[PDB]
From a paper:
Here, we show that the cell binding domain of BoNT A3 binds three monosaccharides of GD1a receptor.
The majority of botulinum neurotoxin (BoNT) serotypes require recognition of both the protein and the ganglioside receptor to gain entry in to the cell.
Author numbering: 871 to 1221, 1229 to 1266, 1272 to 1291
C-alpha cells in the first residue's frame, strides 16, 4: 500500500486512513448519498467544498518523484449550450502557479501539471455525448492518473489505459499542501459531481495495482444499476440487454399463454450540438421484490433470492415460467401475482454485469434469464445453456430514472 492519502466516510464526516492523517475541512453544502454514504455530492456553490490539508512531509516538491491519484467520479449529462467551452476546476492542488489539478469541461476530464517555470502538460479524457449508449455519461467511472517524471502522465478509466502525454520536459513541480474539492469557474449553476475514495500514491502505479484498486473499491458483493449505483429492491428499472442494446423489453400478452420479448429499435433523445443518444426510459419496467433478503436495507446483494415484478399498463405482474415445457429454453411470462401457484419465479441475483438465475421451488436452477430467437422474435427465456457455457444474451443492466440523465418519463 503506497497510498499517502485515502479518504473514506465515517460518522457524518470524512477521514484519511493513511498514516499521514490529512486534516479535512468540509463546507456547509456537501452531501452524502442516503444508500452509499461514501458517495459525496458537490454542487455549484461556494460552501460546497472539501479542503484536504496534507502534512508538510508529503507535499509534492520534485522534478523526479513519481506519483499517482485515483478516485471515482459520476458526471451528469451536459444538457445546456452554457456547458460548451466552460472548463471548470474540480480538484485543485495548485500553489503559486505550480502543482496539479483535475478540471472538467463538456465531455472531458482534464489532468494538468504545472512546473515552477509555468511549463504545463494537459492529459485529456474525451467522451462523446453523440453515442447510442455511453459507457461514461452519468455513470460511475474509476479514474487513475499516473505520473512518471522521466516518461509519461497516463489516464486510466475503469482500469484501462485511455491516453498518455510525455512529461519529461517539465521541471520542478511544487504542489500545494491544500487539495480543494470544489466546482471552480463553472458558469452553470445546476452542475454537480459525485466523487468517492480519493487516493494519492507516491509512485507510478502499474496496471495490476490499478486493476486491484478498481476491484477492491467496487463493493463486489453488491449488484449495481446502469449508473453504477447500488441495485435496490422496490425501485422501477428499464431493462437493457447487453447483447442487443438497441432493443427494449415488451410483453406480447399477460398470462401463461403470453411471452416477453426484445422489441427494436430504441428511439432517440437529442439537443442540437449537445447530445444525441438512444432513449433509455423505454419498455416494460422490472421491479426487484424481497423474497429471502433481510429487513436491514433495500440493497440487492450477490446470491440474494428475489422475485421479479414486471409493469404492464401501470399494473404489476410476476415474471415466471413452467419449467416442464419441452426444450432447454423456458419461455418467460408475466403472470397475475395471485395466479403464479407452483410456477417457477424465484430468481438468484448475481454480480460480471447483472445475471438472474431462475430457480424451481425445489431449489434447482432453471437457468439464466436471457433471450432466444424463435424465427425473428427474441423471446425472453430462462436457459441452463447459459449456465453450462464474454457477452451473452443473459447479461442485463437495470436503468432507473436518474436526475443526471434528464430524459422524460
Ligand atoms: C445456433 C443454434 O441454433 N444454437 C442452439 C442449439 O442448437 C443445436 C445446434 O448447435 C444447431 O446448429 C442445430 O440447428 C438445427 C436446427 O434446429 C434445424 O431446424 C436446422 O434445419 O438444422 C440444424 C441441425 O444442424 O440444432 C441443435 C439442437 O437442436 O441448441 C441449444 C440448446 O441445445 C440452444 O437452443 C442454441 O441456441 C442458443 O440458445 C441460447 C438460450 O438457450 C441463446 O438464445 C443463444 O443466443 C445468443 C445468446 O443469448 O447469447 C444470442 C444470439 O441470438 C445468438 N446468435 C445468433 C443465433 O445469431 C448468440 C450466439 O449463438 C452465440 O451463442 C454467442 O454469440 O447467442 C442461442 O444461440
Amino acid at each position: 500500500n503506497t497510498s499517502i492519502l485515502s479518504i473514506v466516510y465515517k460518522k457524518d464526516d470524512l477521514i484519511d486512513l493513511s498514516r499521514y492523517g490529512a486534516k479535512i475541512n468540509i463546507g456547509d453544502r456537501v452531501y452524502y448519498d442516503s444508500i452509499d454514504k461514501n458517495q459525496i455530492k458537490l454542487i455549484n456553490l461556494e460552501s460546497s467544498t472539501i479542503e484536504v490539508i496534507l502534512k508538510n512531509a508529503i507535499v509534492y516538491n520534485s522534478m523526479y518523484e513519481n506519483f499517482s491519484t485515483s478516485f471515482w467520479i459520476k458526471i451528469p449529462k451536459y444538457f445546456s449550450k452554457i456547458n460548451l467551452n466552460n472548463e471548470y476546476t474540480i480538484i485543485n492542488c495548485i500553489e503559486n502557479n505550480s502543482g496539479w489539478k483535475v478540471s472538467l469541461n463538456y465531455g472531458e476530464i482534464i489532468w494538468t501539471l504545472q512546473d515552477n517555470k509555468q511549463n504545463i502538460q494537459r492529459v485529456v479524457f474525451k467522451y462523446s455525448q453523440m453515442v447510442n449508449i455511453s459507457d461514461y455519461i452519468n455513470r460511475w467511472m474509476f479514474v487513475t492518473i499516473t505520473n512518471n517524471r522521466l516518461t509519461k502522465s497516463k489516464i486510466y478509466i475503469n482500469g484501462r489505459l485511455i491516453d498518455q502525454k510525455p512529461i519529461s520536459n517539465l521541471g520542478n513541480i511544487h504542489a500545494s499542501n491544500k487539495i480543494m474539492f470544489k466546482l471552480d469557474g463553472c458558469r452553470d449553476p445546476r452542475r454537480y459531481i459525485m466523487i468517492k475514495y480519493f487516493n494519492l500514491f507516491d509512485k507510478e502505479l502499474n496496471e495490476k495495482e490499478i486493476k486491484d484498486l478498481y476491484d477492491s473499491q467496487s463493493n463486489p458483493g453488491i449488484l449495481k444499476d446502469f449508473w453504477g449505483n447500488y441495485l435496490q429492491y422496490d425501485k422501477p428499472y428499464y431493462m437493457l440487454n447487453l447483447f442487443d442494446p438497441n432493443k427494449y423489453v415488451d410483453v406480447n400478452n399477460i398470462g401463461i399463454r403470453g411471452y416477453m420479448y426484445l422489441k427494436g429499435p430504441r428511439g432517440s433523445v437529442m439537443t442540437t450540438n449537445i447530445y444525441l443518444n438512444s432513449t433509455l426510459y423505454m419498455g416494460t419496467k422490472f421491479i426487484i421484490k424481497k423474497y429471502a433478503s433481510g429487513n436491514e436495507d433495500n440493497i440487492v446483494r450477490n446470491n440474494d433470492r428475489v422475485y421479479i415484478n414486471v409493469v404492464v399498463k401501470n399494473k404489476e405482474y410476476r415474471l415466471a415460467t413452467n419449467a416442464s415445457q419441452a426444450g432447454v429454453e423456458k419461455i418467460l411470462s408475466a403472470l397475475e401475482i395471485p395466479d403464479v401457484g407452483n410456477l417457477s419465479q424465484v430468481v438468484v441475483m448475481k454480480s460480471n454485469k447483472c445475471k438472474m438465475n431462475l430457480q424451481d421451488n425445489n431449489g434447482n436452477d432453471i437457468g439464466f434469464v436471457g433471450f432466444h430467437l424463435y424465427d425473428n422474435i427474441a423471446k425472453l427465456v430462462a436457459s441452463n445453456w447459459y449456465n453450462r457455457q464474454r457477452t451473452f444474451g443473459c447479461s442485463w443492466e437495470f436503468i432507473p430514472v436518474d436526475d443526471g440523465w434528464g430524459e422524460s418519463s
